[PDB]
Design an enzyme around this catalytic site. Structure first.
Site, mmCIF file in Angstrom:
data_model
loop_
_atom_site.group_PDB
_atom_site.id
_atom_site.type_symbol
_atom_site.label_atom_id
_atom_site.label_comp_id
_atom_site.label_asym_id
_atom_site.label_seq_id
_atom_site.Cartn_x
_atom_site.Cartn_y
_atom_site.Cartn_z
ATOM 1 N N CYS A 26 26.254 14.282 62.043
ATOM 2 C CA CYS A 26 26.428 15.572 61.358
ATOM 3 C C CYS A 26 25.584 16.586 62.084
ATOM 4 O O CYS A 26 24.358 16.418 62.200
ATOM 5 C CB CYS A 26 26.038 15.492 59.883
ATOM 6 S SG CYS A 26 26.489 16.972 58.953
ATOM 7 N N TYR A 86 27.035 20.946 50.966
ATOM 8 C CA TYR A 86 25.643 20.559 50.940
ATOM 9 C C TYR A 86 25.510 19.144 50.407
ATOM 10 O O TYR A 86 26.229 18.764 49.452
ATOM 11 C CB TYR A 86 24.797 21.458 50.013
ATOM 12 C CG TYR A 86 24.801 22.888 50.527
ATOM 13 C CD1 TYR A 86 23.899 23.284 51.537
ATOM 14 C CD2 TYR A 86 25.765 23.777 50.147
ATOM 15 C CE1 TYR A 86 23.996 24.515 52.153
ATOM 16 C CE2 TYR A 86 25.853 25.034 50.752
ATOM 17 C CZ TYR A 86 24.995 25.388 51.778
ATOM 18 O OH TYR A 86 25.190 26.590 52.407
ATOM 19 N N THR A 87 24.550 18.394 50.986
ATOM 20 C CA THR A 87 24.205 17.088 50.416
ATOM 21 C C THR A 87 22.835 17.237 49.752
ATOM 22 O O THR A 87 21.821 17.474 50.433
ATOM 23 C CB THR A 87 24.148 15.995 51.484
ATOM 24 O OG1 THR A 87 25.417 15.968 52.127
ATOM 25 C CG2 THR A 87 23.771 14.692 50.874
HETATM 26 C C1 FAD Z 1 28.125 17.330 54.728
HETATM 27 C C2 FAD Z 1 27.201 18.502 54.961
HETATM 28 C C3 FAD Z 1 26.013 18.630 54.289
HETATM 29 C C4 FAD Z 1 25.164 19.706 54.493
HETATM 30 N N1 FAD Z 1 23.994 19.769 53.790
HETATM 31 C C5 FAD Z 1 23.186 20.809 54.013
HETATM 32 C C6 FAD Z 1 21.910 20.849 53.302
HETATM 33 O O1 FAD Z 1 21.559 19.994 52.484
HETATM 34 N N2 FAD Z 1 21.138 21.933 53.596
HETATM 35 C C7 FAD Z 1 21.524 22.983 54.449
HETATM 36 O O2 FAD Z 1 20.668 23.903 54.608
HETATM 37 N N3 FAD Z 1 22.726 22.977 55.051
HETATM 38 C C8 FAD Z 1 23.500 21.914 54.847
HETATM 39 N N4 FAD Z 1 24.707 21.874 55.530
HETATM 40 C C9 FAD Z 1 25.092 23.043 56.281
HETATM 41 C C10 FAD Z 1 25.776 24.071 55.384
HETATM 42 O O3 FAD Z 1 27.120 23.662 55.079
HETATM 43 C C11 FAD Z 1 25.885 25.446 56.054
HETATM 44 O O4 FAD Z 1 26.452 25.273 57.343
HETATM 45 C C12 FAD Z 1 24.559 26.157 56.167
HETATM 46 O O5 FAD Z 1 24.045 26.404 54.856
HETATM 47 C C13 FAD Z 1 24.700 27.507 56.894
HETATM 48 O O6 FAD Z 1 25.726 28.273 56.223
HETATM 49 P P1 FAD Z 1 25.607 29.839 56.122
HETATM 50 O O7 FAD Z 1 26.757 30.291 55.321
HETATM 51 O O8 FAD Z 1 24.233 30.261 55.729
HETATM 52 O O9 FAD Z 1 25.790 30.295 57.674
HETATM 53 P P2 FAD Z 1 27.144 30.830 58.339
HETATM 54 O O10 FAD Z 1 27.373 32.185 57.904
HETATM 55 O O11 FAD Z 1 28.226 29.850 58.160
HETATM 56 O O12 FAD Z 1 26.690 30.840 59.854
HETATM 57 C C14 FAD Z 1 27.301 30.007 60.909
HETATM 58 C C15 FAD Z 1 26.259 29.208 61.755
HETATM 59 O O13 FAD Z 1 25.490 30.211 62.450
HETATM 60 C C16 FAD Z 1 24.249 29.541 62.867
HETATM 61 N N5 FAD Z 1 23.150 30.460 62.602
HETATM 62 C C17 FAD Z 1 23.223 31.635 61.836
HETATM 63 N N6 FAD Z 1 22.074 32.240 61.808
HETATM 64 C C18 FAD Z 1 21.250 31.459 62.595
HETATM 65 C C19 FAD Z 1 19.875 31.553 62.937
HETATM 66 N N7 FAD Z 1 19.091 32.545 62.419
HETATM 67 N N8 FAD Z 1 19.365 30.522 63.735
HETATM 68 C C20 FAD Z 1 20.067 29.459 64.139
HETATM 69 N N9 FAD Z 1 21.374 29.344 63.867
HETATM 70 C C21 FAD Z 1 21.895 30.331 63.056
HETATM 71 C C22 FAD Z 1 24.060 28.198 62.037
HETATM 72 O O14 FAD Z 1 24.337 27.060 62.849
HETATM 73 C C23 FAD Z 1 25.200 28.372 61.008
HETATM 74 O O15 FAD Z 1 25.616 27.169 60.476
HETATM 75 C C24 FAD Z 1 25.531 20.734 55.407
HETATM 76 C C25 FAD Z 1 26.711 20.584 56.092
HETATM 77 C C26 FAD Z 1 27.558 19.487 55.916
HETATM 78 C C27 FAD Z 1 28.802 19.378 56.731
#
Ligand code: FAD
Length: 272
Positions: free
Chosen positions: A245, A65-66
């Site tokens: 990103c 997260y950023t």
């Molecule tokens: C450098 C960097 C900075 C980031 N900063 C932020 C930040 O500030 N805030 C932030 O919220 N995230 C940020 N992210 C994204 C974060 O790392 C996660 O990918 C995000 O929180 C989702 O993770 P999760 O574990 O909830 O989903 P996971 O369990 O990893 O799910 C995988 C993917 O499924 C997709 N997905 C799942 N459910 C749905 C749905 N209901 N609708 C649409 N797509 C869906 C999403 O694309 C998701 O990323 C950043 C990523 C990077 C690389």
């Protein structure tokens, strides 16, 4: 003197206490966590991010997260989070692991932060230090403009850099952001981006695309494509740095092929 930093060692996990949770909209939150004292700063160089880690339903989950805060903020760190609820998106029935776990947290619960992490650091006044891998020294490159392509959650790395440039009145770098989302409703941080455009239009160019557009829509519809890159990022003749990103298919299919078609060196386009 300088404030005490929280992220003293990148291999240490720092459990930070949840102190406030804002419901920004149905699926968007701002979480504020206390630093170890009110006088601490996070210690996160511009360009870098943190990781959150937790045991979620019995399994380790780590995500980057950023923050939307900066090292100017004393005593807290703020994360803006898109919550991916289960049973919303047909391709992702389980929804997202860390984002739903964050949504579940009670005030006073802690979660582990680590950092700083990332291969890119912004050194100011157009200068970026970019390592090819973690074990290697950075290539210092100085640019006059930065193209930025964000999708979805990928906005916060861009916002962090935009904010750092605009707050330096003697930083003449021009940022051009092309920000893609599923729908208008799903856009994160729109007021914040539009505030920056209102105050810094000479230095900050803003454009949106949405996969599907509302009836009333002033910007682009569809995935990032060659035209949008020509129209909304600096031309390759100016040798901008290009930052990206977003979801892997966006980078792979929409961004890199089209950056190449316009003539940007694909090998030099940096993905956070
Ligand atoms: C450098 C960097 C900075 C980031 N900063 C932020 C930040 O500030 N805030 C932030 O919220 N995230 C940020 N992210 C994204 C974060 O790392 C996660 O990918 C995000 O929180 C989702 O993770 P999760 O574990 O909830 O989903 P996971 O369990 O990893 O799910 C995988 C993917 O499924 C997709 N997905 C799942 N459910 C749905 C749905 N209901 N609708 C649409 N797509 C869906 C999403 O694309 C998701 O990323 C950043 C990523 C990077 C690389």
């Amino acid at each position: 003197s300088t404030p005490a930093i929280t992220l003293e060692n990148p291999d240490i996990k720092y459990p930070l206490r949840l102190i406030d949770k804002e419901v920004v909209n149905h699926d968007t939150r701002r979480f504020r966590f206390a630093l170890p004292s009110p006088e601490h700063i996070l210690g996160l160089p511009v360009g870098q991010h943190i990781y959150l880690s937790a045991r979620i339903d019995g399994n380790l989950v780590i995500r980057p997260y950023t923050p939307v805060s900066s090292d100017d903020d004393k005593g807290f760190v703020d994360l803006v989070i898109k919550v991916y609820f289960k049973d919303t998106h047909p391709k992702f029935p389980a929804g997202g692991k860390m984002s739903q776990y964050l949504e579940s947290m009670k005030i006073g619960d802690t979660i582990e932060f680590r950092g700083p992490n990332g291969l890119l650091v912004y050194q100011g006044k157009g200068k970026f230090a970019i390592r090819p891998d973690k074990k290697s020294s950075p290539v210092i490159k100085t640019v006059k403009s930065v193209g930025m392509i964000a999708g979805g959650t990928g906005i916060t790395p861009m916002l962090q850099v935009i904010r750092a440039i605009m707050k330096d009145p003697d930083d003449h770098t021009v940022c051009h952001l092309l920000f893609a989302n599923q729908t208008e409703k799903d856009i994160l941080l729109r007021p914040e981006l539009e505030e920056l455009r209102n105050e810094h239009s000479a230095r900050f160019k803003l454009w949106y695309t949405v996969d599907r557009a509302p009836e009333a829509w002033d910007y682009s519809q569809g995935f990032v494509n060659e035209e949008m890159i020509r129209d909304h990022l600096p031309p390759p003749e100016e040798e901008p740095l290009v930052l990206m990103c977003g979801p892997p298919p966006m980078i792979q299919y929409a961004c890199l092929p089209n950056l190449e078609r316009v003539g940007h060196p694909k090998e030099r386009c940096f993905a956070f």
